[PDB]
């Protein structure tokens, strides 16, 4: 699967503190994966079927800054560590996976696409182990099948003595 990724920053920190306080986003949203930030931590979101989905341990119950004001969380499932907002116009939704393939590809905030082997509903193993510091801030990022459809979003790193060896994720069916 020749899946690649490229990260584009659309905002600085000053513009982030300001847009955070107001709740009003002037910018035009594009893409399927969004890079999110509260002023103090940064993580990912994936738009699937109308909703911008991310992790609770990242977003909390916070509103998302939108074109015409703060967008309230329509969906919150603390049991699953999942939140969603209705996607702002411009944010294209990804197509949920069909092939039921077990060969997955995790997209990180650093625009890398990591091969992952599915082990259960919520579990896949990293074919190559990764440093913990390398994966931090990538929760909410999608796991894609070889054709390129969403099977879930990254939730937690499964570690073996300080090094990530597997990923735990929220399946698409859960959303």
């Amino acid at each position: 699967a020749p899946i690649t990724a490229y990260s584009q920053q659309t905002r600085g920190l000053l513009g982030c503190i300001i847009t955070s306080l107001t709740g009003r986003d002037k910018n035009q949203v594009d893409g399927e994966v969004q890079v999110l930030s509260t002023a103090t931590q940064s993580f990912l979101a994936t738009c699937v079927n109308g909703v911008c989905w991310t992790v609770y341990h990242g977003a909390g119950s916070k509103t998302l800054a939108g074109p015409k004001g703060p967008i309230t969380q329509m969906y919150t499932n603390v049991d699953q560590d999942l939140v969603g907002w209705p996607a702002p116009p411009g944010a294209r939704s990804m197509t949920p996976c069909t092939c039921g393939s077990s060969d997955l590809y995790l997209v990180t905030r650093h625009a890398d696409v990591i091969p992952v082997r599915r082990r259960g509903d919520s579990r896949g193993s990293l074919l190559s182990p990764r440093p913990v510091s390398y994966l931090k801030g990538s929760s909410g990022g999608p796991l894609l099948c070889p054709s390129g459809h969403v099977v879930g979003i990254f939730r937690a790193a499964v570690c073996t003595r300080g090094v990530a060896k597997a990923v735990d994720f929220i399946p698409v069916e859960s959303m």
């Binding site: 699967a1 020749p2 899946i3 690649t4 990724a5 490229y6 990260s7 584009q8 920053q9 659309t10 905002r11 982030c16 847009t19 955070s20 306080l21 107001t22 709740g23 986003d25 910018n27 949203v29 594009d30 893409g31 399927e32 994966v33 969004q34 890079v35 999110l36 930030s37 509260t38 002023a39 940064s42 990912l44 979101a45 991310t54 977003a59 916070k62 509103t63 998302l64 800054a65 703060p70 702002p88 997209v107 905030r109 625009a111 990022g141 894609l144 390129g148």
Partner: peptide, 13 residues
């Protein structure tokens, strides 16, 4: 405060 879209990840292939 709100959560803010500060960037995006463009996918390909």
């Amino acid at each position: 405060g709100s959560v803010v879209i500060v960037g995006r990840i463009i996918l390909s292939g």
